[PDB]
Design an enzyme around this catalytic site. Structure first.
Site, mmCIF file in Angstrom:
data_model
loop_
_atom_site.group_PDB
_atom_site.id
_atom_site.type_symbol
_atom_site.label_atom_id
_atom_site.label_comp_id
_atom_site.label_asym_id
_atom_site.label_seq_id
_atom_site.Cartn_x
_atom_site.Cartn_y
_atom_site.Cartn_z
ATOM 1 N N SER A 1 10.147 3.835 -1.741
ATOM 2 C CA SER A 1 10.050 3.050 -1.985
ATOM 3 C C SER A 1 10.927 2.445 -3.035
ATOM 4 C CB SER A 1 9.036 1.859 -2.932
ATOM 5 O OG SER A 1 7.517 2.905 -2.694
ATOM 6 N N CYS B 1 7.360 -2.712 -9.860
ATOM 7 C CA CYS B 1 6.040 -2.592 -8.644
ATOM 8 C C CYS B 1 5.345 -3.387 -9.831
ATOM 9 C CB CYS B 1 5.644 -1.075 -9.139
ATOM 10 S SG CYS B 1 3.619 -0.699 -8.257
ATOM 11 N N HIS C 1 11.946 6.639 -9.135
ATOM 12 C CA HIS C 1 10.367 6.525 -10.258
ATOM 13 C C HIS C 1 10.548 6.955 -10.911
ATOM 14 C CE1 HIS C 1 7.965 5.276 -6.153
ATOM 15 N NE2 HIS C 1 8.388 5.419 -6.113
ATOM 16 N N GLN D 1 3.142 8.140 -0.846
ATOM 17 C CA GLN D 1 4.321 9.536 -0.643
ATOM 18 C C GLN D 1 4.026 10.423 -1.560
ATOM 19 O OE1 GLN D 1 6.801 6.055 0.579
ATOM 20 N NE2 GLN D 1 6.293 5.024 -1.411
ATOM 21 N N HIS E 1 3.914 4.243 -13.675
ATOM 22 C CA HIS E 1 5.378 4.575 -13.414
ATOM 23 C C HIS E 1 6.292 3.490 -13.542
ATOM 24 C CE1 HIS E 1 5.731 3.172 -8.967
ATOM 25 N NE2 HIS E 1 5.035 1.855 -9.939
HETATM 26 C C1 LIG Z 1 -0.663 2.683 -5.611
HETATM 27 C C2 LIG Z 1 0.467 1.529 -5.284
HETATM 28 C C3 LIG Z 1 2.074 2.507 -5.910
HETATM 29 N N1 LIG Z 1 3.169 2.860 -5.060
HETATM 30 C C4 LIG Z 1 2.904 3.705 -5.724
HETATM 31 C C5 LIG Z 1 3.820 5.257 -5.796
HETATM 32 S S1 LIG Z 1 3.810 5.493 -3.857
HETATM 33 O O1 LIG Z 1 5.593 6.288 -4.060
HETATM 34 O O2 LIG Z 1 3.185 6.548 -3.995
HETATM 35 C C6 LIG Z 1 3.976 3.556 -3.623
HETATM 36 C C7 LIG Z 1 3.124 3.436 -3.268
#
Ligand SMILES: C#CCN1CCS(=O)(=O)CC1
Length: 147
Positions: free
Chosen positions: A138, A97, A141, A115, A43
């Site tokens: 976060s 990230c 993406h 998430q 991502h």
């Molecule tokens: C592992 C990791 C980093 N990030 C991945 C996308 S998320 O939106 O699930 C938040 C955590």
């Protein structure tokens, strides 16, 4: 009719039909082709002022607005789709990230780990496919499914 989450729509500029996925936010002219326990995705994350943690390895304090973050995401999708830039190159230079150091790669995962908007979009992609903007706590993406 069509694979999970895809629907038909009409283009406002051309009047031509296209296809849109309300789980991944992908859109395309061509009719889409064709669930696993694990998938593998990279991502590119653009954070903003309403991000859960408004801090990244690129910026100690992120100030940009949600709307500016989305315009950045939109431009990166443009360059990827036209072939001017590779997904991996843009994730290495611009993802907020820490996975930017591994070209955006997150490894393989199951349902129940990420998430939920991220998880839903990742499992609705086919191998090789990329999402449109995906919103989570976060930031925003771009997700590319690799396995
Ligand atoms: C592992 C990791 C980093 N990030 C991945 C996308 S998320 O939106 O699930 C938040 C955590």
């Amino acid at each position: 009719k069509l694979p999970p989450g895809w629907e038909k729509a009409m283009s406002r500029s051309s009047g031509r039909v296209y296809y849109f996925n309300h789980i991944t936010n992908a859109s395309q002219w061509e009719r889409p082709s064709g669930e696993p326990a694990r998938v593998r995705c990279s991502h590119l994350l653009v954070k903003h002022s309403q991000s859960r943690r408004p801090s990244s390895w690129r910026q100690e304090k992120i100030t940009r607005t949600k709307e500016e973050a989305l315009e950045l995401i939109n431009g990166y999708i443009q360059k990827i789709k036209s072939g001017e830039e590779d997904f991996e190159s843009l994730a290495s230079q611009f993802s907020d990230c820490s996975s930017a150091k591994a070209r955006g790669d997150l490894g393989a995962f199951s349902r129940g780990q990420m998430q939920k908007p991220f998880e839903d979009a990742s499992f609705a992609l086919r191998t090789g496919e990329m999402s449109g903007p995906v919103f989570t706590d976060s930031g925003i993406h771009i997700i590319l499914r690799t396995e």
